[PDB]
Amino acid sequence: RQDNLLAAIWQDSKGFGYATLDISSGRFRLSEPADRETMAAELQRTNPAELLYAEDFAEMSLIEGRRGLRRRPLWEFEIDTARQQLNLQFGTRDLVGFGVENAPRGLSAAGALLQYAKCTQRTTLPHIRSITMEREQDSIIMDAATRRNLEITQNLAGGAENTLASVLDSTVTPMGSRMLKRWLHMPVRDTRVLLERQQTIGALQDFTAGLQPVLRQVGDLERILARLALRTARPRDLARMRHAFQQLPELRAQLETVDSAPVQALREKMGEFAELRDLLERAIIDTPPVLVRDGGVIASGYNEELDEWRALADGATDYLERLEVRERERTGLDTLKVGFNAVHGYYIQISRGQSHLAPINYMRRQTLKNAERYIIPELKEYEDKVLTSKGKALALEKQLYEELFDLLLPHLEALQQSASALAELDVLVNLAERAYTLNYTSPTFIDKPGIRITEGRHPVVEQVLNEPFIANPLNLSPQRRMLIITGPNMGGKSTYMRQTALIALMAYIGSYVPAQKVEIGPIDRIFTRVGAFMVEMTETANILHNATEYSLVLMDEIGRGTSTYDGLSLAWAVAENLANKIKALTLFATHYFELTQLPEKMEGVANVHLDALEHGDTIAFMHSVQDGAASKSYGLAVAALAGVPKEVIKRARQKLRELESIS
Amino acid sequence: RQDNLLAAIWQDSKGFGYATLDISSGRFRLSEPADRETMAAELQRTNPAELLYAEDFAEMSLIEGRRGLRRRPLWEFEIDTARQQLNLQFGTRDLVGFGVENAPRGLSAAGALLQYAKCTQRTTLPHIRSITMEREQDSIIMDAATRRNLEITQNLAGGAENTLASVLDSTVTPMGSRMLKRWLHMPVRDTRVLLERQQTIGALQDFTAGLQPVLRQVGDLERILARLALRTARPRDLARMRHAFQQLPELRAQLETVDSAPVQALREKMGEFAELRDLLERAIIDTPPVLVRDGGVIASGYNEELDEWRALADGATDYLERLEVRERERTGLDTLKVGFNAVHGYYIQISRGQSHLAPINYMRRQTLKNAERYIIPELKEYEDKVLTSKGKALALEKQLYEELFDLLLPHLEALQQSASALAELDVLVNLAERAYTLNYTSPTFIDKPGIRITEGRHPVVEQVLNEPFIANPLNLSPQRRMLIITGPNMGGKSTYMRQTALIALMAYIGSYVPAQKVEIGPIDRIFTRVGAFMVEMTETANILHNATEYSLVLMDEIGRGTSTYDGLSLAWAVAENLANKIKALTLFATHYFELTQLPEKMEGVANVHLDALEHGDTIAFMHSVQDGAASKSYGLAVAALAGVPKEVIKRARQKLRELESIS
Amino acid sequence: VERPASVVKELVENSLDAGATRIDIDIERGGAKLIRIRDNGSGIKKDELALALAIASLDDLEAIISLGFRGEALASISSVSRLTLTSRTAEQQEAWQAYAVTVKPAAHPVGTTLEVLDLFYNTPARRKFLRTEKTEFNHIDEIIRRIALARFDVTINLSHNGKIVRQYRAVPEGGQKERRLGAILGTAFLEQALAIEWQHGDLTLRGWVADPNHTTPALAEIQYFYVNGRMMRDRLINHAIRQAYEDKLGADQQPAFVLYLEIDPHQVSRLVHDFIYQGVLSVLQ
Amino acid sequence: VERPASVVKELVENSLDAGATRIDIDIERGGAKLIRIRDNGSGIKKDELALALAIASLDDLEAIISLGFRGEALASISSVSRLTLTSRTAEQQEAWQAYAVTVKPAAHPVGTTLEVLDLFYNTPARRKFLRTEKTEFNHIDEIIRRIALARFDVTINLSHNGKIVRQYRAVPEGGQKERRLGAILGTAFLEQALAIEWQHGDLTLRGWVADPNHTTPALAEIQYFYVNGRMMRDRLINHAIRQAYEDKLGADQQPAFVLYLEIDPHQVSRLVHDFIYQGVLSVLQ
Ligand SMILES: Nc1ncnc2c1ncn2[C@@H]1O[C@H](COP(=O)(O)OP(=O)(O)NP(=O)(O)O)[C@@H](O)[C@H]1O
Ligand SMILES: Nc1ncnc2c1ncn2[C@@H]1O[C@H](COP(=O)(O)OP(=O)(O)NP(=O)(O)O)[C@@H](O)[C@H]1O
């Protein structure tokens, strides 16, 4: 069992994109290996008997030892044609349903392999059906629909409200917020690292409060290091850094008592940097002005010369007072005052009546409406010594400041390490504190796919909601792999569904989770359909072609259709497909009742529904998941809750039982 | 002939909010008069026999001459209770369906009038059914759903792509882009002003090209005037202003020939400002540095004193060259160069081999590794005259610059007027050019509600489409007031609908429109429902209670339901209601076919549908509106366009005719 | 029922009497605008809900007023307010609810919830009086703090204006009680806490006393005495303990303590006095 | 059919010959990637679409090859490319279409559209010789500019990369022709334009000539001569006009003109030469 395999590859100056093909079977995949060893490992793996390359390929070192090589022209690897070509092959108007739409580096390779295949085979090839992506970050990942829809870091309207962030992010520092938000975009699936995080997160719960405020002192050390590296760093940035360095002995002490070797490792990563603290302490005032431009930054006592040039301008005011007083009493003019002007320098002003009663030492620099100003050599002498000393003290200050960049940069990587460590600790501690604040539990990992939730809760909705969340369990497995969910509106369909999503993600950053007890097997891929028609359908197919035996599939109201039957038919299928062939762990939210016949029709499918207690003027939504199926029409009831006038509600129910009197 | 009326009012320091009630009929409205005369006119109009006010009302002058006054406590006007109270009165969870949800200033007034009414009547009052907003700008009303949905200035993903703006905004200056985008947010409905704009827009089409580039020179004059007013304006901002002032004689000439008195009026508003040009021209260099801080801004020849202090530092380079040359000659050391240092001042450096071959005039200031630097008295005293003169020249420069703010500000309003005129002209010309570029037509206004389109086109989609749009007409009136639209997906339902919207808005800014000929009567309010359940319903009721005999109602796929009949029933009603009672100009996009029985059921309703031509195993979407109704299920067909595997499509069609074999 | 503090304290103890382990308490605006109590104590059946508040509706119904001594406290509150009771019984039922005058079902767990807008709704003055905003919470904050040390077995969450303020976890039976002691009285007290365990016959004295040697101005604010659960501030005990702080070290400064006494019914008798005294002094040495 | 400029010019004139008043011409990437021609000239029936490109399919069909002299130009392009014809006839019909693998109906107005992607599906070099593209558009820009002055009755929109570049409006018959003259030749020529109207028997000369007195380096770039529509390559007329610019003012610098001549044939015959000359000189004075 070693096959006849074909491949194509093209590169831009960014990285690589790759595609393959077997003429015996008709198999077609894509990828975008970013670096060299990955690209070499991908040719090694697939091992094409025949390999395509564009004339101008740069990293030839990969392919010149390989067999059955095929030099091709450039124009054949153009995305425009490539996309156009392959789209009419599969027949679609886009490659949305394939899950590769914006991966063009790979698509030139798929595009050139098809023009070659058209021309290698030159007959119809309908044993080539599709194309799918394998995924760079294989601690596997979550589509764009899920992301925009789950609002983990951004909501409906585009703010940060009702977010998983809004809850979890009570991180004290901005570098905590980012890394907290990043771990959400990229869940960790090396089992080892997940458990490292749980051990750390649990051991901190006794020290939640003691540590928190210490980190709020730091500020964004990370971004400060940036302007340091760029050499655009400003005084008050270096100031909050110093304040951060002063917390290091404190944190070193508090963490040494904590029982977790991963904590002891991160405690080292933090570091101390005693000498770096010392320099900043000796060089700079407590909190100087905003920029360095107009000085006032370096403290006296760091540099002798600094204080020297400062002593020239410090012989200023008393010099001019003695002048003002001597000259006032020598001339006999009391309106005589020695003042400064930005424009002209210093001067001696006398009021107009007394002005021509002044001595002949005085040289006119400035006539006024109400006075005459004069200059004298003693002042004009002294004018210089001040103005210049200022400049050169200022100049020394600029010099000393930018020299500090030279002094810190040799440890620049060691500081980034500490900055990364501290950012991560804020995240860990915040989470230790969110499990302390909101009572989350520590889960465990199992062998094969399955989720068990014991009285779990939607971690966002419960915090925003009037009443406490109606906690529900969930029990899924390879034996019980699908749940047909029917019921009333505001029944909690989409809620019971999307809540499930949050459980996984949370467990898979090593954090504790909103439930009594949670056990979980492998779940690689997390796909979603988000209500609204071109649009609706297209994404559905993606989830089909890519989702696996171990994935999580998230369906709500597919078949917002053009007719009675389309919707139903459509659905009927997709469900049977996920139970019959794919065998993934699925949750299927629907309104089209006939599907509830599927637990009997299929092995592995079982009925559930959010039961409603519908009574008189009002109606009750248990917000509880019940074994069985939905009753009936719940829309007519919900109608008024919008604000429907009864002109309509009664025309609705008057027609409803014209219709419901047939069935 | 006359009434019995009740009212309530409360104010914050921002403005007023108002509410009313008649116990005979049970009528309940809201408003937020912003200023005093509007508030006085609103009490004058409604003329309550009984009027409520909170103890602490500030503008008492409105109410102390009025009859049947009732002093009330503060706490009764609190929004929290008010909202809570009124919500349980109507029974809803929110006031979304009333179209007043975010008008809290008015709602305190409505809130306090209900606690009083509970306590004035204490009797059954289900003759109080609803609450609705009248809108200050009788000129316009387009709801939030329409706005976020129509993507006139912003698309779904949050960019500016596929927008009406992306097309229309070929405005050359940023102040054009804004005002262009603003007129879209607020359509003008004084018929006079609309026709003024058409006359202007048509007369410019011969001068499209001639004017365009002249305005791109201006830049954002408007925002420059801002930092002028704030006194934060910078050199290069004043520079682009000057460049703008130089275009004024040019524009004055080009527009004098154009035939439109509204153009001749706007030509005056532009103005000239000859003296203001003169000052900037004489005071500033072509393009100075970024800020004023480090000088180099004011040109020589504006100020004698400026050039005086500049003459001291102007005796710099030649003084030091003659020194460098004389001393190089005199000593015989050619590596001798006279240089400057920020730290130590000027010096004379010689290379190490030649260093001890220098004369004894030289005083050591600075030893180096590979040279010796020296100072001499000639240099050290010349050092001063430069460094100080610079400062005081710099100081004069700062003074002169901020004084210019004093000189321009007496015309500040006249300049804003020109800035507004120019911003508006870019918009007008841009639109004159978009009608020139995209061949739009000039419409006319009629008496009573109705739209007639002759071969009209969706102005966005046709530009993003690689093809000309399938232009279609439209014929609506008070006699033909509703169109039931059924058909295939990608039929162009939502398209033929949303296109209608754009026509109105465009016509109602006085611009030409994408159609052969367009005539239109009054349309006040423009409401919309945007595919995706709690969500979908609530907004529906709003449109009900607010929409009028003259409005435009925009329905697409209401009744994405929980069951067979709910959706249908629901819709059935809404339609009948808008035809039977409200009598508005409506367009109803649906997928529930039984509704197509409504042309027979109602007066004023007529069937239309987007017809599709299915040939074997491909399908054609005519993109053309046909009299009659839809065929069938078009979803099974669209399925593959996603990319559906045939495991499923054939299970679909295998079940489809199990289902369709009953009906 | 004059302050919000008083309405809080009583309705907090209604749930305690119903055997409660979890109590959510939520407020907005010093108590003026919102007060929300949720409990896991046993519930109120659908018959008992209506007439506990509505007063000629009692006449016909045959003394079912019986089940509900909170019903006494509720009735007074309800006539002049905007009250909302909602509850599902421990007995398999659906949840039922009372407002403002509608009884209908809604949803809820095993227990009871009470939602309210500013109690007096037609009394012009008694509202106009209702003290500040800030201080009313600071009083409520103490109400919970008192009942908290009285019951280590009930989890209480206090929040203000949507935001969590105080989270007192119930200590497991036979558990680490130092957790809850630091949470209520700050960390400063916790680290100076010297426990006490004295016992003579029927009488039994348990608790903590801050070491006088390291008792500072911040710590001195903690003086609470409970007897079989109930705090009385009877001046007798004032002596017993200020005698004890004087007798270890002469400096008579303000002590820091929280003590628990368990005896058989005898409201206040000198027996109790010297019992207290001897317990504390041994502990300090 | 070597350059994109050539394929453009020919297929632009296919529609003119079909009596066209509106012509849309759209390009991307120097012509390499995209070329789109839409016309309002008469259309192509559903029978005539197939065999104009596909070549044994002509045999059985009874000389309907007749209607389609563009069909000659189309056939050569089609065998080695990615072509899309689509058209609805002025007569009895729905719109029909041909691609790349399919004939089916789609939609279109009265006329014809032609869409295309880069030719040579397996020829390595002949593509290498398509120019640096920038220049290819600058050539196409001239193609349209030439045919534009030849036909004042046809509205032409030239665009590049989706974006409008040039819009030549058709002047109403007996209308203001100064509007189109400024659009094609810039405003500089327009304002120096001195019209010409000369007439001897069968021969008739109409047009414009930039006043030599105010003819600058920018203006001298405009020299185009048409005879009953058609621009020829004849050195003769060079003399007639450089004789005319020399004879008004001696300074023999490069002129600016666009002239229209209407006769019965004298292909190059001296008759035509002095007729031209005398027309221009009178106009300059
Ligand atoms: N288990 C629960 N406990 C408490 N509240 C809940 C629960 N489930 C849902 N809710 C609330 O009920 C609201 C609506 O529920 P949702 O899941 O959106 O209904 P649905 O069945 O998807 N139908 P619709 O939303 O109308 O299409 C949400 O805003 C939740 O805040
Ligand atoms: N008159 C037209 N001419 C050309 N293209 C059109 C026209 N109308 C619609 N389209 C295109 O057809 C598609 C359908 O538009 P739309 O109105 O959203 O369809 P729909 O009937 O609402 N069903 P769906 O889009 O599946 O929900 C879009 O891709 C448009 O670009």
Author numbering:
A (entry chain A), B (entry chain B): 128 to 659, 670 to 800
C (entry chain C), D (entry chain D): 20 to 73, 80 to 125, 132 to 299, 315 to 331
Lines from the paper:
MMR is initiated when a MutS homolog binds to a mismatch. Upon ATP binding MutS releases the mismatch and travels as a ‘sliding clamp’ along the DNA helix, and this specific state of MutS is recognized by MutL or its homologs. Once recruited by the MutS sliding clamp, the MutL homologs activate downstream repair. Here, we trap the transient complex between MutS and MutL to resolve a crystal structure of the MutS sliding clamp bound to MutL.
We crystallized the MutSΔC800/MutLLN40 complex in the presence of DNA containing a G:T mismatch and the non-hydrolyzable ATP analog AMP-PNP (adenylyl-imidodiphosphate). The complex crystallized in several different space groups, diffracting to resolutions from 7.6 to 4.7 Å. The crystal structure shows a novel conformation of MutS, in which the subunits in the dimer are tilted across each other by ∼30°, compared to the mismatch recognition state. Meanwhile, the connector domains are rotated by ∼160° around a hinge at residues 265–266, which moves these domains out of the center of the molecule and packs them against the ATPase domains. The mismatch-binding domain could not be resolved in the density, probably because it is flexible in this state. The MutLLN40 interaction with MutSΔC800 involves two interfaces. The first interface is formed by the largest β-sheet of the ATPase domain of MutLLN40, and the ATPase and core domains of one subunit of MutSΔC800. The second interface involves the side of this same β-sheet and a looped-out helix of MutLLN40, and the newly positioned connector domain of the other MutSΔC800 subunit. We observe nucleotide density in the ATP binding sites of both subunits in the MutSΔC800 dimer, and since we crystallized the protein with AMP-PNP we modeled these nucleotides in the density. The subunit tilting has occluded the original DNA binding site, but because the connector and mismatch-binding domains have moved, a large channel (∼35 Å wide) in MutS has become accessible, which could easily accommodate a DNA duplex (20 Å diameter).
